[PDB]
Design a protein around this ligand. Structure first.
Ligand SMILES: *[C@@H]1O[C@H](CO)[C@@H](O[C@@H]2O[C@H](CO)[C@@H](O[C@@H]3O[C@H](CO[C@H]4O[C@H](CO)[C@@H](O)[C@H](O)[C@@H]4O)[C@@H](O)[C@H](O)[C@@H]3O[C@H]3O[C@H](CO)[C@@H](O)[C@H](O)[C@@H]3O)[C@H](O)[C@H]2NC(C)=O)[C@H](O[C@@H]2O[C@@H](C)[C@@H](O)[C@@H](O)[C@@H]2O)[C@H]1NC(C)=O
Ligand SMILES: *[C@@H]1O[C@H](CO)[C@@H](O[C@@H]2O[C@H](CO)[C@@H](O[C@@H]3O[C@H](CO[C@H]4O[C@H](CO)[C@@H](O)[C@H](O)[C@@H]4O)[C@@H](O)[C@H](O[C@H]4O[C@H](CO)[C@@H](O)[C@H](O)[C@@H]4O)[C@@H]3O)[C@H](O)[C@H]2NC(C)=O)[C@H](O[C@@H]2O[C@@H](C)[C@@H](O)[C@@H](O)[C@@H]2O)[C@H]1NC(C)=O
Ligand SMILES: *[C@@H]1O[C@H](CO)[C@@H](O[C@@H]2O[C@H](CO)[C@@H](O[C@@H]3O[C@H](CO)[C@@H](O)[C@H](O)[C@@H]3O)[C@H](O)[C@H]2NC(C)=O)[C@H](O[C@@H]2O[C@@H](C)[C@@H](O)[C@@H](O)[C@@H]2O)[C@H]1NC(C)=O
Ligand SMILES: *[C@@H]1O[C@H](CO)[C@@H](O[C@@H]2O[C@H](CO)[C@@H](O[C@@H]3O[C@H](CO)[C@@H](O)[C@H](O)[C@@H]3O)[C@H](O)[C@H]2NC(C)=O)[C@H](O[C@@H]2O[C@@H](C)[C@@H](O)[C@@H](O)[C@@H]2O)[C@H]1NC(C)=O
Ligand SMILES: *[C@@H]1O[C@H](CO)[C@@H](O[C@@H]2O[C@H](CO)[C@@H](O[C@@H]3O[C@H](CO)[C@@H](O)[C@H](O)[C@@H]3O)[C@H](O)[C@H]2NC(C)=O)[C@H](O[C@@H]2O[C@@H](C)[C@@H](O)[C@@H](O)[C@@H]2O)[C@H]1NC(C)=O
Ligand SMILES: *[C@@H]1O[C@H](CO)[C@@H](O[C@@H]2O[C@H](CO)[C@@H](O[C@@H]3O[C@H](CO)[C@@H](O)[C@H](O)[C@@H]3O)[C@H](O)[C@H]2NC(C)=O)[C@H](O)[C@H]1NC(C)=O
Ligand SMILES: *[C@@H]1O[C@H](CO)[C@@H](O[C@@H]2O[C@H](CO)[C@@H](O)[C@H](O)[C@H]2NC(C)=O)[C@H](O)[C@H]1NC(C)=O
Ligand SMILES: CCCCCCCCCC(=O)N[C@@H](c1cccc2ccccc12)P(=O)(O)O
Ligand SMILES: CCCCCCCCCC(=O)N[C@H](c1cccc2ccccc12)P(=O)(O)O
Ligand SMILES: CC(=O)N[C@@H]1[C@@H](O)[C@H](O)[C@@H](CO)O[C@H]1O
Ligand SMILES: CC(=O)N[C@@H]1[C@@H](O)[C@H](O)[C@@H](CO)O[C@H]1O
Ligand SMILES: *[C@@H]1O[C@H](CO)[C@@H](O)[C@H](O)[C@H]1NC(C)=O
Ligand SMILES: [Cl-]
Ligand SMILES: [Cl-]
Ligand SMILES: [Cl-]
Ligand SMILES: [Fe+3]
Ligand SMILES: [Fe+3]
Ligand SMILES: [Zn+2]
Ligand SMILES: [Zn+2]
Lengths: 425, 428
């Protein structure tokens, strides 16, 4: 039943050297891709928050300075968490960066995206509910061996599953950071907050929602004028990506509601044709597990997604894969009986991709027969790839952990809802 | 937009209590779970002053001192005066107490009457006031409440207090005036506070990004007494009623603090101690007015089935500037593809009452969905207030009084039959 990887697993090895940086991870640090947040932990002493970096093209070494933080959770004391934003990066350029400049230096690299534009191709990985089981490791292996070559991971929430351990044993956040480093140190992952990040534990006097996650994983939320790390937007290549918080407030007048309504107004499909929404809890879901948990946010935001021609909504939370038809359920007025989802070519596709591994359990129970709103579903571990070719075409594919790394078990062409709104069913 | 109907600053209801550093904007609310405590609140403008409260019952008369805390805030270019909150505890039930504030310079005296101990057949009269504001209509509603022959003993307040956020930069002076205006009631009987959308004051354009800041500095609630982690949701018991206060503009997704709190809190209700189970929220789950139609749908998906499972007697809300009383219905059978989305009569469900018509800034919400739906019993766009008069464990009498009527006329009334002790069809 415990399918979590043991503490002495190779993927959790501590990088050697006195105060060697560990749990190194990067994410986009600005609105348009010219910056990068570099994050890592030192365990032996605070160390330096400086990052040394240079482009392959110019080879000029520069230093950026950041900030160190620590937290406590019950009887756990963290190591020294560093976050440093490197700025004014050149587009479409390979950079190297080094952390741990005082004692044990470690070097990594990333490639900045091209400048935002109509036809800029870009390959997004889709990972959800990863955890640290053996299944999780297989999914990560399949992602990094994919011939499609993902360039940025859109991560739809539920990271370490540390909160399943006694007192949320936050050592299991540290192991998760060491395990995922082999990917996220070299390409950004775009973070969404899920229910396993809430860690609301009044019984051990831990009452601040999202505390361990928010200390460890920073996002560039001020760059889209959000007032909270849990909802924010970034642009990358031909995509505008909106990250939402299933477990924050979204009533009319609340910060998240206000921010999203204004952010949708700011989207420019003439600059980023692909409009992508990330959230943890799926609004369309025909699995037994968490059935209808997404109704609340759906009543608030579904009609806006249709009005603004969102291309696709990605969610996790359900430990399985599902791809909806383009559907809407926005005509209900309490007493008019109109509560059945209908085919709606102006609506986004809703994809559930929470099947990366969690702690080793798949959600296999489905409502039968498959409802008309659901196009394809399967209870298998795996990951997705959203591969943009240009302003009109993107190719989505789903890869199963039991298939070869080059095998797509589901795949479908997306026709852009703004630039090429022809029926893609 | 809209003609300015707010009472002007030199109005008599806004007069400053005289004397150097005289306490103003005095208000009280229940300070504990069961009614043996009171939070005393007030503002001093000239200097910090003392947070001490001198209090004594009229029977014995032994004078005691409770020590509280002082705080201040800024909002854009506004700086608050000095805000005091002080909790008097271990009071005797059903007892008149005198209390005094301003002990260093200008003392002012007030009084309150503690409720009886909680119990199955304890009568008690609650006023219902929503979306009050500080227009001339607001002043009439409060006058009608004060003059009611039924004698309200505690106000259940369903949100939208001062409407200060309608002024430029939310001119927080209009919080002070509202405090001075409502003192003539709330300094002498508790008002039970619910947070509405006008308390959010989310104003990133002037760098004020902390939800509820002015409200939460000025109005405290005994939220830790029900083991809540936030002032915006909590519960209290008073006489024969168990009152649950919820926050429409906080998170209530599964696993969130409020959601988790409410689910545990409902399990603590014991209808043999407090037979009347009452919920307050700002945004109504049932509402057949065009203004804010279906805004309550999100919370309804999370909580309506719980209200029916625990046989809540009544849910009070404001937000819509009008009056409405539902039938006992539920709409909890929907499963996406089973097509069951019409409310049905359900004798385990509460009655939903919208009572957000106390005045606001002088505007009534008169556009209604047509025809009146089956789930709506009575609706009318008039300014007024309600009274929930508990007689015993089986009967409570609700009445609605209109500002255009005499203070003793009820344009709507209905006997509530208790859902635990007497679940009889009380419709119409
Ligand atoms: C943060 O708080 C956590 C919760 O308190 C700490 O974890 C607890 O740490 C205590 C140690 O103080 C553990 O208790 C001990 O468990 C010993 C284990 O022996 C077991 O080994 C065999 C292996 O085959 C088992 O099959 C069998 O169960 C056997 O008992 C035990 O020998 C000790 O007696 C001791 O106390 C046990 O006895 C009590 C007396 O009645 C029992 O009531 C109780 O069941 C105790 O287990 C405890 O198990 C552990 N709890 C959990 C949930 O993990 C944590 O401590 C840190 O982590 C643990 C795992 C240890 O390594 C500990 O040394 C370390 O400090 C705290 N962390 C920090 C940083 O402070
Ligand atoms: C935006 O991106 C999308 C997705 O990539 C583009 O759509 C693709 O466009 C390419 C062309 O650029 C299409 O590939 C071409 O397909 C034809 C037809 O293939 C079929 O028929 C063959 C016989 O006719 C058959 O043998 C074959 O197996 C298949 O069944 C191929 O003939 C063609 O290959 C030949 O031409 C190229 C070009 O010189 C040579 O290099 C080859 O050696 C061959 O001689 C080529 O592979 C592809 O099918 C499209 N994909 C999809 C999913 O539609 C899109 O292009 C635009 O839209 C398509 C539909 C066409 O109208 C394009 O011409 C058009 O540009 C991109 N949009 C823009 C504006 O670029
Ligand atoms: C972690 O990294 C710091 C900074 O690089 C180390 O501190 C530095 O250690 C050097 C030893 O190689 C010190 O310089 C040496 O001084 C001698 C004569 O004093 C000179 O020949 C020449 O300048 C040498 O480089 C240097 O002063 C020191 N810098 C400080 C303390 O700011 C640190 O070394 C460890 O801590 C210091 C306090 C010493 O005790 C070292 O022996 C010890 O290894 C590094 N820490 C570890 C654990 O490796
Ligand atoms: C508001 O209330 C404060 C506190 O009561 C007043 O300040 C206090 O004034 C006392 C004199 O009335 C000061 O007396 C001190 O104690 C003994 C007697 O107990 C004196 O014999 C001795 O000389 C001390 O000075 C007391 O120090 C002072 N407390 C403070 C300042 O914290 C205040 O009075 C105003 O300020 C004081 C300083 C005097 O100048 C008064 O004339 C003046 O009115 C009160 N303010 C007002 C406007 O009423
Ligand atoms: C709880 O409180 C309700 C409301 O006050 C009680 O119901 C009321 O009981 C009164 C008896 O004390 C009734 O008054 C009498 O009415 C007749 C007309 O039929 C008059 O001629 C007579 O002079 C009295 O005025 C009153 O009508 C009634 N009100 C309602 C709305 O029903 C209730 O009493 C209990 O239930 C009622 C239905 C009767 O069975 C009563 O006998 C019985 O005690 C109170 N319940 C409890 C448990 O205390
Ligand atoms: C708000 O409503 C209240 C209650 O209806 C009004 O109170 C009335 O105003 C003052 C007290 O605030 C009282 O004034 C009295 O009348 C003469 C003037 O004719 C005055 O000179 C006397 O000294 C005396 O105090 C009046 O009796 C009182 N009425 C009551 C308590 O029933 C208040 O005016 C209203 N304010 C606004 C702005 O609408
Ligand atoms: C997780 O998956 C990786 C990648 O498949 C495994 O990496 C292997 O590590 C061993 C020793 O650590 C090497 O000898 C192999 O060459 C690696 N395999 C590949 C394909 O690179 C890793 O062992 C897995 N860890 C766990 C705990 O399952
Ligand atoms: C379907 C028609 C348009 C959608 C709803 C817009 C109309 C609501 C605005 C209003 O007419 N009234 C209330 C109000 C005040 C201030 C902020 C509000 C934010 C959201 C809501 C109300 C607010 P009110 O002024 O009555 O308090
Ligand atoms: C059966 C005991 C063995 C281990 C149990 C640990 C499983 C926790 C994580 C999980 O497997 N499921 C979460 C979940 C499941 C069921 C109900 C839930 C209700 C509220 C929130 C989450 C819920 P998750 O958030 O991951 O879906
Ligand atoms: C962050 C936080 O509130 N932590 C609380 C602390 O404030 C409180 O005093 C006490 C509860 O027992 O310890 C813990
Ligand atoms: C002063 C300014 O320009 N911006 C402020 C910021 O400094 C402050 O941290 C925040 C709340 O504390 O309110 C805003
Ligand atoms: C305060 O006001 C506006 C917020 O929209 C902005 O121009 C200014 O930079 C803000 N100051 C901050 C965020 O420090
Ligand atoms: Cl270092
Ligand atoms: Cl809402
Ligand atoms: Cl939810
Ligand atoms: Fe999960
Ligand atoms: Fe209102
Ligand atoms: Zn989840
Ligand atoms: Zn309102």
């Amino acid at each position: 039943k415990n399918r979590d990887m043991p503490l002495d697993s190779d993927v959790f090895r501590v990088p050697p050297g006195y105060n060697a940086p560990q749990q190194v991870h990067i994410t986009q640090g600005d609105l348009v891709g010219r910056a990068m947040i570099i994050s890592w932990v030192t365990m032996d002493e605070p160390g330096s928050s400086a990052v040394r970096y240079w482009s392959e093209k110019n080879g000029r070494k520069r230093i950026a300075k950041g900030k160190m933080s620590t937290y406590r959770f019950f009887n756990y004391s963290s190591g020294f968490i560093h976050h440093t934003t490197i700025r004014k990066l050149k587009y479409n350029t390979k950079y190297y960066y080094e952390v741990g400049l005082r004692n044990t230096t470690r070097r990594f690299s990333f490639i900045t995206p091209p400048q935002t534009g109509l036809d800029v191709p870009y390959t997004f990985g889709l990972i959800g509910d990863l955890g640290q089981s053996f299944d999780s490791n297989t999914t990560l292996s399949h992602y990094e061996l994919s011939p499609k070559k993902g360039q940025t991971v859109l991560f739809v929430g539920d990271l370490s599953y540390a909160d399943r351990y006694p007192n949320h044993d936050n050592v299991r956040w540290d192991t998760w950071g060491r395990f995922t480093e082999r990917s996220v140190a070299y390409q950004p992952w775009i973070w969404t907050a899920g229910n396993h990040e809430i860690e609301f534990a009044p019984e051990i006097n831990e009452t601040e929602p999202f505390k361990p996650f928010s200390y460890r994983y920073h996002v560039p939320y001020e760059a889209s004028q959000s007032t909270s790390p849990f909802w924010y937007s970034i642009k990358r290549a031909s995509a505008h990506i909106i990250v939402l918080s299933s477990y924050s407030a979204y009533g009319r007048g609340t910060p998240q509601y206000t921010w999203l309504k204004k952010e949708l107004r700011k989207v420019k499909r003439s600059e980023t044709p692909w409009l992508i929404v990330l959230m943890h809890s799926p609004l369309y879901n025909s699995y037994n597990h968490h059935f209808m948990e997404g109704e609340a946010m759906r009543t608030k935001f579904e009609a806006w997604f249709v009005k603004y021609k969102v291309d696709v909504v990605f969610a996790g939370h359900v430990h399985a894969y599902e791809r909806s038809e383009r559907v809407s359920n926005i005509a209900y007025k309490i007493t008019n009986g109109l509560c059945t989802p209908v085919k709606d070519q102006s609506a986004p596709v809703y994809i559930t991709i929470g099947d990366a591994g969690n702690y080793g359990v798949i959600d296999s129970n489905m409502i039968q027969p498959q409802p008309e709103y659901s196009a394809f579903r399967e209870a298998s571990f795996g990951h997705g790839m959203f591969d943009i070719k240009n302003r009109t075409h993107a190719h989505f594919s789903w890869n199963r952990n039991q298939d070869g790394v080059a095998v797509e078990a589901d795949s479908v062409w997306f026709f852009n809802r703004h630039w090429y709104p022809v029926d893609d069913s």
